[PDB]
From a paper:
Insulin is a 51-amino-acid protein hormone with two disulfide-linked chains (A1–A21 and B1–B30) that is responsible for the maintenance of metabolic homeostasis, with an impact on cell proliferation and regulation of ageing. It exerts its functions through binding as a monomer to the tyrosine kinase-type IR, which is an (αβ)2 heterotetramer in which each individual αβ extracellular chain comprises L1, CR, L2, FnIII-1, FnIII-2 and FnIII-3 domains. Therefore, we undertook further mutagenesis-driven studies of insulin, focusing on the TyrB26 site that we assumed might be the critical structural pivot of insulin conformational activation on its receptor.
Interestingly, the [AsnB26]-insulin increased its potency towards IR-B to 142% with a minimum loss of IR-A affinity (83%). This makes AsnB26 a unique single-mutation full-length analogue that is ∼1.7 times more IR-B selective with an overall wild-type-like IR affinity. In contrast, the substitution of TyrB26 by a shorter polar side chain in the AsnB26 mutant results not only in loss of the water-mediated ‘hydrogen bridge’ but also in a repulsive character of this interaction owing to the incorporation of a polar side chain into a hydrophobic environment. The most important feature of these analogues is the occurrence of the B25–B30 bend that detaches this part of the B-chain from the insulin core. It seems that the B24–B25 peptide bond in [AsnB26]- and [GlyB26]-insulins serves as a ‘rotation axis’ for the B25–B30 chain, sweeping it almost 180° away from its wild-type direction. Moreover, the peptide NH of AsnB26 increases the stability of the B26 bend through a hydrogen bond to OD1 of the A-chain C-terminal AsnA21. The side chain of AsnB26 is also near enough (∼3.5 Å) to the CO group of ThrB27 to make another hydrogen bond that would stabilize this region even further. Therefore, the introduction of the Asn residue in the B26 site enhances the stability of the newly formed, bent insulin conformer. Therefore, the structure of [AsnB26]-insulin with the characteristic B26 bend is likely not to be accidental but represents a favourable and stable conformation of this analogue. Moreover, the unexpected but significant IR-B selectivity of the AsnB26 mutant that is correlated with the characteristic bend of the B-chain of the hormone may give the first structural insight into the structural origins of differential insulin signalling through the IR-B and IR-A isoforms.
Numbering used by the authors:
A (entry chain B): 1 to 28
B (entry chain A): 1 to 21
Write the structure that this text describes.
Amino acid sequence: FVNQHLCGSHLVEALYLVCGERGFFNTP
Amino acid sequence: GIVEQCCTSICSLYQLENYCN
């Protein structure tokens, strides 16, 4: 059945999408 | 962390967003 886990490139893609301009894996 | 919450388990939008800068 369909699954809801975000792994690998899917998790990367999800962070690109939801973080937008805020970004992620950065330091200020 | 994020891999155990989102990949092993399932994460909600606000869990995911809180990992953003």
